[PDB]
Amino acid sequence: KPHTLLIVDDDDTVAEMLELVLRGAGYEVRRAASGEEALQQIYKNLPDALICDVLLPGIDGYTLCKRVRQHPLTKTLPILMLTAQGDISAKIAGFEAGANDYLAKPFEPQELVYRVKNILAR
Numbered sequence: 001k002p003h004t005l006l007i008v009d010d011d012d013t014v015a016e017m018l019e020l021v022l023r024g025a026g027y028e029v030r031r032a033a034s035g036e037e038a039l040q041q042i043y044k045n046l047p048d049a050l051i052c053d054v055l056l057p058g059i060d061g062y063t064l065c066k067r068v069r070q071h072p073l074t075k076t077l078p079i080l081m082l083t084a085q086g087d088i089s090a091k092i093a094g095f096e097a098g099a100n101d102y103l104a105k106p107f108e109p110q111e112l113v114y115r116v117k118n119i120l121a122r
Contacts, residue, residue, distance in 0.1 A: 003048065005027050005030065005049050006041065008031075008035060008052040009033070009053040021113065027116075030045075035058055035059040035067075039068075042074060043074075049080065050079045051079075051080045051082065052099075054081055054082065061081060062097040065099050066097050068098075081099040081102040082104075085106065090102070091104075
Protein backbone atom coordinates (compact mmCIF):
# COMPACT_ATOMS: atom_id res chain seq x y z
CA LYS A 1 0.00 0.00 0.00
CA PRO A 2 1.31 3.61 -0.73
CA HIS A 3 2.71 5.13 2.50
CA THR A 4 5.34 7.78 1.42
CA LEU A 5 4.48 11.50 1.18
CA LEU A 6 6.69 14.43 0.21
CA ILE A 7 5.67 17.80 1.62
CA VAL A 8 7.06 20.72 -0.44
CA ASP A 9 6.70 23.76 1.81
CA ASP A 10 9.04 26.49 3.10
CA ASP A 11 6.67 27.40 6.01
CA ASP A 12 7.92 25.43 9.08
CA THR A 13 4.76 26.04 11.16
CA VAL A 14 2.43 24.62 8.45
CA ALA A 15 4.83 21.81 7.34
CA GLU A 16 5.22 20.61 10.98
CA MET A 17 1.41 20.57 11.54
CA LEU A 18 0.76 18.67 8.23
CA GLU A 19 3.43 16.11 9.12
CA LEU A 20 2.01 15.62 12.66
CA VAL A 21 -1.46 14.84 11.26
CA LEU A 22 -0.07 12.61 8.42
CA ARG A 23 2.24 10.71 10.86
CA GLY A 24 -0.87 10.01 12.93
CA ALA A 25 -2.47 8.56 9.75
CA GLY A 26 0.50 6.14 9.40
CA TYR A 27 2.43 7.82 6.57
CA GLU A 28 6.20 8.13 6.07
CA VAL A 29 6.55 11.91 5.69
CA ARG A 30 9.46 13.57 3.86
CA ARG A 31 9.95 17.32 3.50
CA ALA A 32 11.60 19.64 0.98
CA ALA A 33 11.68 23.46 1.48
CA SER A 34 11.59 24.43 -2.26
CA GLY A 35 10.51 23.16 -5.68
CA GLU A 36 14.21 23.01 -6.75
CA GLU A 37 15.09 20.74 -3.81
CA ALA A 38 11.86 18.68 -4.31
CA LEU A 39 12.76 17.96 -7.97
CA GLN A 40 16.24 16.65 -7.00
CA GLN A 41 14.81 14.45 -4.17
CA ILE A 42 11.84 13.01 -6.15
CA TYR A 43 13.97 11.43 -8.88
CA LYS A 44 16.50 10.03 -6.35
CA ASN A 45 13.68 8.49 -4.14
CA LEU A 46 10.19 8.46 -5.65
CA PRO A 47 7.47 9.19 -3.07
CA ASP A 48 3.85 7.98 -3.50
CA ALA A 49 2.38 11.54 -3.48
CA LEU A 50 3.34 15.23 -3.26
CA ILE A 51 1.77 17.85 -0.94
CA CYS A 52 2.86 21.13 -2.46
CA ASP A 53 2.35 24.74 -1.35
CA VAL A 54 1.43 27.03 -4.36
CA LEU A 55 3.89 29.55 -2.76
CA LEU A 56 7.58 28.50 -2.78
CA PRO A 57 10.92 30.45 -2.51
CA GLY A 58 12.07 29.75 -6.09
CA ILE A 59 9.77 28.27 -8.74
CA ASP A 60 6.14 28.38 -7.52
CA GLY A 61 4.01 25.25 -6.75
CA TYR A 62 2.24 25.43 -10.16
CA THR A 63 5.65 25.31 -11.95
CA LEU A 64 6.72 22.42 -9.69
CA CYS A 65 3.48 20.54 -10.53
CA LYS A 66 3.90 21.20 -14.30
CA ARG A 67 7.55 19.96 -14.22
CA VAL A 68 6.67 16.76 -12.27
CA ARG A 69 3.86 16.07 -14.83
CA GLN A 70 6.41 16.38 -17.73
CA HIS A 71 8.72 13.57 -16.31
CA PRO A 72 7.65 10.04 -17.54
CA LEU A 73 8.33 8.46 -14.08
CA THR A 74 5.95 10.99 -12.34
CA LYS A 75 3.40 11.71 -15.15
CA THR A 76 0.59 10.39 -12.91
CA LEU A 77 2.23 11.01 -9.47
CA PRO A 78 -0.65 12.14 -7.14
CA ILE A 79 -0.29 15.81 -6.13
CA LEU A 80 -2.21 17.75 -3.51
CA MET A 81 -1.89 21.54 -3.76
CA LEU A 82 -1.96 23.70 -0.59
CA THR A 83 -3.90 26.93 -1.23
CA ALA A 84 -4.71 30.11 0.75
CA GLN A 85 -8.01 30.49 2.61
CA GLY A 86 -10.76 31.71 0.27
CA ASP A 87 -8.45 31.68 -2.79
CA ILE A 88 -10.60 30.39 -5.72
CA SER A 89 -8.08 31.40 -8.46
CA ALA A 90 -5.44 29.13 -6.78
CA LYS A 91 -7.83 26.08 -6.96
CA ILE A 92 -8.37 26.74 -10.71
CA ALA A 93 -4.61 27.25 -11.36
CA GLY A 94 -3.83 24.08 -9.32
CA PHE A 95 -6.04 21.92 -11.55
CA GLU A 96 -4.69 23.68 -14.70
CA ALA A 97 -1.13 22.76 -13.55
CA GLY A 98 -2.20 19.06 -13.29
CA ALA A 99 -2.80 18.66 -9.53
CA ASN A 100 -5.20 15.88 -8.41
CA ASP A 101 -6.82 17.98 -5.64
CA TYR A 102 -6.16 20.91 -3.31
CA LEU A 103 -6.64 21.76 0.36
CA ALA A 104 -7.14 25.31 1.59
CA LYS A 105 -5.59 26.81 4.76
CA PRO A 106 -6.18 26.24 7.78
CA PHE A 107 -6.06 22.59 6.49
CA GLU A 108 -8.80 20.78 8.51
CA PRO A 109 -7.00 17.54 9.70
CA GLN A 110 -9.75 15.03 8.77
CA GLU A 111 -10.08 16.76 5.33
CA LEU A 112 -6.29 16.47 4.79
CA VAL A 113 -6.35 12.70 5.59
CA TYR A 114 -9.45 12.19 3.37
CA ARG A 115 -8.07 14.05 0.31
CA VAL A 116 -4.61 12.39 0.55
CA LYS A 117 -6.27 8.94 0.82
CA ASN A 118 -8.51 9.69 -2.22
CA ILE A 119 -5.71 10.95 -4.55
CA LEU A 120 -3.64 7.83 -3.59
CA ALA A 121 -6.56 5.40 -4.18
CA ARG A 122 -7.51 6.69 -7.71
